[PDB]
Design an enzyme around this catalytic site. Sequence first.
Site, PDB file in Angstrom:
ATOM      1  N   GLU A  34       0.862  -0.982  -0.061  1.00 49.60           N
ATOM      2  CA  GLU A  34       0.116  -0.038   0.032  1.00 49.60           C
ATOM      3  C   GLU A  34       0.871   1.326   0.143  1.00 49.60           C
ATOM      4  OE1 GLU A  34      -2.127   0.817   3.704  1.00 49.60           O
ATOM      5  OE2 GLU A  34      -3.801   0.394   2.417  1.00 49.60           O
ATOM      6  N   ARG A  97      -4.342  -4.732   0.538  1.00 49.26           N
ATOM      7  CA  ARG A  97      -5.651  -3.974   0.360  1.00 49.26           C
ATOM      8  C   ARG A  97      -6.015  -3.885  -1.069  1.00 49.26           C
ATOM      9  NH1 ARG A  97      -5.073  -0.059   4.935  1.00 49.26           N
ATOM     10  NH2 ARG A  97      -6.528  -0.891   6.644  1.00 49.26           N
TER      11      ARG A  97
HETATM   12  N1  LIG Z   1      -9.020   4.239   1.276  1.00 45.50           N
HETATM   13  C1  LIG Z   1      -8.670   4.707   2.307  1.00 45.50           C
HETATM   14  N2  LIG Z   1      -9.199   5.705   3.036  1.00 45.50           N
HETATM   15  C2  LIG Z   1      -8.756   6.156   4.192  1.00 45.50           C
HETATM   16 CL1  LIG Z   1      -9.459   7.637   4.829  1.00 45.50          CL
HETATM   17  N3  LIG Z   1      -7.602   5.743   4.805  1.00 45.50           N
HETATM   18  C3  LIG Z   1      -6.899   4.886   4.101  1.00 45.50           C
HETATM   19  C4  LIG Z   1      -7.383   4.242   2.969  1.00 45.50           C
HETATM   20  N4  LIG Z   1      -6.508   3.043   2.532  1.00 45.50           N
HETATM   21  C5  LIG Z   1      -5.713   3.099   3.492  1.00 45.50           C
HETATM   22  N5  LIG Z   1      -5.712   4.230   4.487  1.00 45.50           N
HETATM   23  C6  LIG Z   1      -4.716   4.505   5.636  1.00 45.50           C
HETATM   24  O1  LIG Z   1      -3.592   3.863   5.162  1.00 45.50           O
HETATM   25  C7  LIG Z   1      -2.768   4.123   6.287  1.00 45.50           C
HETATM   26  C8  LIG Z   1      -1.865   2.770   6.606  1.00 45.50           C
HETATM   27  O2  LIG Z   1      -2.694   1.564   6.177  1.00 45.50           O
HETATM   28  C9  LIG Z   1      -3.693   4.162   7.853  1.00 45.50           C
HETATM   29  O3  LIG Z   1      -3.785   5.399   8.250  1.00 45.50           O
HETATM   30  C10 LIG Z   1      -5.092   4.043   6.679  1.00 45.50           C
HETATM   31  F1  LIG Z   1      -5.454   2.444   6.677  1.00 45.50           F
HETATM   32 MG   LIG Z   2      -0.172  -0.869   5.703  1.00 47.43          MG
END
Ligand SMILES: Nc1nc(Cl)nc2c1ncn2[C@@H]1O[C@H](CO)[C@@H](O)[C@@H]1F
Ligand SMILES: [Mg+2]
Lengths: 229, 229
Positions: A34, A97
Amino acid sequence: RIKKISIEGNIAAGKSTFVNILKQLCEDWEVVPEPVARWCNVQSTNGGNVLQMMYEKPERWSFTFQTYACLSRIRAQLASLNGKLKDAEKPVLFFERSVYSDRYIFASNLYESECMNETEWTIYQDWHDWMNNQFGQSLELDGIIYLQATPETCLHRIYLRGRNEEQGIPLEYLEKLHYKHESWLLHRTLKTNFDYLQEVPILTLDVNEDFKDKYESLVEKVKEFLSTL
Amino acid sequence: RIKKISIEGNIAAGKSTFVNILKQLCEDWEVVPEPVARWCNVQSTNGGNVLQMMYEKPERWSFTFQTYACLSRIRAQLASLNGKLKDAEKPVLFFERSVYSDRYIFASNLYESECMNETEWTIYQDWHDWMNNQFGQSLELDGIIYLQATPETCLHRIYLRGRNEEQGIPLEYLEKLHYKHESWLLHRTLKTNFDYLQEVPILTLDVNEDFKDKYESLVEKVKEFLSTL
Ligand SMILES: Nc1nc(Cl)nc2c1ncn2[C@@H]1O[C@H](CO)[C@@H](O)[C@@H]1F
Ligand SMILES: [Mg+2]
Ligand SMILES: Nc1ncnc2c1ncn2[C@@H]1O[C@H](COP(=O)(O)OP(=O)(O)O)[C@@H](O)[C@H]1O
Ligand SMILES: Nc1ncnc2c1ncn2[C@@H]1O[C@H](COP(=O)(O)OP(=O)(O)O)[C@@H](O)[C@H]1O
Ligand SMILES: Nc1nc(Cl)nc2c1ncn2[C@@H]1O[C@H](CO)[C@@H](O)[C@@H]1F
Ligand SMILES: [Mg+2]
């Protein structure tokens, strides 16, 4: 031609930790992380930190974040579909994810929290659909790995990781995300525009316990689940 | 395989009016209108009016508008590259404004007006580049038609058209857009990431005068300019 598995789970549930023990289990596996750090210092392919902007004023920055976060993940996942993996034997591609989490978990939730008005919400889905419509077919998942942990375990692991933007995250937010994961990957009662998902295989791993121990088990259940794909 | 010409010009300079006399000049011509009405009632492929939201609070809605407005125009232009035109003889496709206007004229200007912070501005260009990177090569222009009118003529034609969101538009805004068109299509001193543009042919039409009269001339200069392409 490459098995693509998505790793799903709540904030700080243990995804990156699980991702790091994956490559060493087989030279045939690939991992697309991610792009979290890239959301923290917005630069073109030291600047702004949209992740923090959103966590500090969600009704102002949720759309922007959702717009950039998703496009970002797609590019990363698409790029990896043009690497050494193509030359592999039993290539299995892991996604940290998916575009689904982005939309049916986070975006969906920010909108139900009045953090995105109808207009923003309509524009986002229209974009999200059209995105899949394009470079979508080549990203379909063959299987999902739900890393399951209580929102209370999550809130503590956040504290351990130390990422600053996340330190202000309330249990309540982690709960909302929890039930959406449960609704989608556990009870499987979530509705989406992508029909295949409904049938897609799912592996649920209870990662509430120490990684130090449950490790050996997980590896087994992963290789296992993977063979059945 | 299809000549694609972009029609450029200031707000209410006379683009739609010019577009309506085009199809009747040759069955071989096609026109992709600017999805203006679709920005006024945001619906998925009566709701929100992002065009007005932006005109009423630009530092809040410029990014969103720029994000949706551009994707929108691309889809419209791409769709038309899959119509009856493919079966045509001397197919000439007209575009009402281009992804360039969106970025180097409007978006560029809203950002210079502090209506988009660095973060928003960085994310927008990154998206805009990646967009062209994808479905771009098939949209390159063979020629441009700059509909030139004074920002003062524009401010009055706005009043004639009667579109509500535009009624609050100040001369000052029309001036800023004017000089950017002049800089790009007249003096040709505008820098862009798309090199071919710099060489692309340009037809400048002074549409400050009554359409009733200058019509016959224009038709000539259009057919003319088109033959030289
Ligand atoms: N799609 C996402 N929307 C938001 Cl508001 N936050 C996200 C999203 N995808 C990942 N994150 C964020 O990415 C960071 C690391 O996973 C976390 O603060 C949270 F899960
Ligand atoms: Mg992560
Ligand atoms: N199963 C586990 N047992 C004990 N600690 C864990 C476990 N999984 C993750 N952690 C801890 O949580 C932190 C990492 O969380 P992280 O992997 O970044 O969550 P995510 O992958 O969703 O971003 C690390 O500092 C690590 O010490
Ligand atoms: N050359 C012209 N002479 C006189 N009136 C014009 C001319 N061009 C446009 N108009 C007037 O301006 C209005 C249309 O402006 P419009 O074509 O919508 O600008 P744009 O195409 O940039 O949106 C109409 O109501 C029409 O009466
Ligand atoms: N890219 C654009 N950005 C902004 Cl702020 N406004 C735009 C853009 N493209 C078109 N418009 C608007 O569309 C309407 C009709 O052309 C006018 O209010 C104005 F020209
Ligand atoms: Mg128009």
